[PDB]
């Protein structure tokens, strides 16, 4: 079930990836974290590719 994460992070804004080592997310999605490196991004898994997305757009599920 939870495999890939257990904490998983909600989409809170629509982003679009700005190049092929960024992710795209939309507004209400559910992504799964991989790693919290930094507090300016976080490494997600989104659909099939996994990148960072910046935490200021982002918000955990705990």
């Given at each position: 079930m939870d495999?890939?994460?257990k904490?998983?992070?909600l989409a809170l804004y629509d982003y679009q990836?700005?190049?092929p080592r960024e992710v795209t997310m939309?507004?209400?999605d559910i992504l799964?974290?991989?790693n919290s490196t930094n507090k300016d991004w976080?490494?997600?898994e989104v659909n099939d590719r996994?990148?960072?997305v910046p935490?200021?757009?982002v918000k955990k599920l705990d």
């Open positions: 495999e890939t994460g904490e998983l992070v990836e700005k190049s939309k507004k209400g799964t974290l991989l976080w490494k997600v996994q990148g960072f935490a200021a757009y």
